[PDB]
């Protein structure tokens, strides 16, 4: 069988700018374990109907996992724009796969503020699909070169989410797992 429970149930999820990518190959993928779980608040699939996953075979399955807030969960979709889509994680316009997200307020939020999750705020250009940019070079927002020193018009590209339990539903952390298809179901 395929190690889905090594992906969805993992204790450590990476920040969105440094999203993980887990190979799933040479296994039987039973996707019915995904449908029949109470907490999965977004099982969205593009190009494949969710109910027909058990009848299809794929050569590879890649599971990208990261943590964002509820307000940018809609940003994980083909042809979407914004901070997560443009600077952190871009899905191709011809994306074939499923995007799975669920609220993890009890696991990723701390009353004093969980600063452990980062996102990229500034970048020279939009990310290509499935491209990862872990560089933390000082972004030059103006004309005077930064020379690696932050300050005026010299912003560090990464910001902290600051997850707390008392935040609203849109501001609570959401754990997102993106399945890429292009491993036979049974």
């Amino acid at each position, epitope marked *: 069988l395929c190690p889905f429970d090594e992906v969805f*149930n*993992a204790t450590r999820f990476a920040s969105v700018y440094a999203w993980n990518r887990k190979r799933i190959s040479n296994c039987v993928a039973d996707y019915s374990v995904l449908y029949n779980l109470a907490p999965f608040f977004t099982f969205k699939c593009y190009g494949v109907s969710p109910t027909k996953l058990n009848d299809l075979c794929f050569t590879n399955v890649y599971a990208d996992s990261f943590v964002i807030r509820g307000d940018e969960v809609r940003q994980i979709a083909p042809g979407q724009t914004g901070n997560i889509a443009d600077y952190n994680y871009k899905l191709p316009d011809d994306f074939t796969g499923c995007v799975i997200a669920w609220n993890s307020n009890k696991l990723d939020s701390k*009353v004093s503020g969980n600063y*452990n999750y980062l996102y990229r705020l500034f970048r020279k250009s939009n990310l290509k699909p499935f491209e990862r940019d872990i560089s933390t070079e000082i972004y030059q927002a103006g004309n005077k070169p930064c020379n690696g020193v932050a300050g005026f018009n010299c912003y560090f590209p990464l910001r902290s989410y600051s997850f707390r339990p008392t935040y609203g539903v849109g501001h609570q952390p959401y754990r997102v797992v993106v399945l890429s298809f292009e491993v036979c179901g049974k």
Partner: antibody
Amino acid sequence: VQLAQSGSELRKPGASVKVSCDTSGHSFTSNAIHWVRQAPGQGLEWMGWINTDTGTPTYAQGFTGRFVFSLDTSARTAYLQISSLKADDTAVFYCARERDYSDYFFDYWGQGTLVTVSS
Amino acid sequence: EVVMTQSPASLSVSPGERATLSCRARASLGISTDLAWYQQRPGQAPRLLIYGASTRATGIPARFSGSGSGTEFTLTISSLQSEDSAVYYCQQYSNWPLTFGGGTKVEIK
């Protein structure tokens, strides 16, 4: 490192047992306090955890339905509820608390509460 | 769930001799050094020896050295004393069926 729990307790089959775990002896930068069950002869079994300051309990595969985790009003002492006790439910229930946040190993452990189901 | 096969189930080695304890986990993708070693002397509650694959907890003597990464893990105790005769468990804080090992009963000759 020696979280103070409740003492040993004898309960007839079908009754309910109240296991406490005082945590106020130290200062913890964590929101999770975990419960571990150890059989009288077997090894350690992870029961689950309850989210401090949120009160949301999480249970393992075999420790759901009859096992209820609860907190205090001050969110310091965590209580454990076992209902409809069977004769095979006698065990030592350890109260484990992690030192730092999102460090899911248990540096701080309770003294252990042994429930006995007999007559 | 991640299931440990902690072997040997019981050691019996002389004092002053290295005791190697192994904890293999049935994880397809591996754990990647998310293992915790506990020690439960008869009576008292388990004591966290080693968090992570290698680094030891505060107050733990240098004898308890950990090793391993991914799937095969190994704990070694050098220069055993009479107070190291206990039961050693291994835990994965990787997924969320947090599972302890079967335990190894270390005995001093």
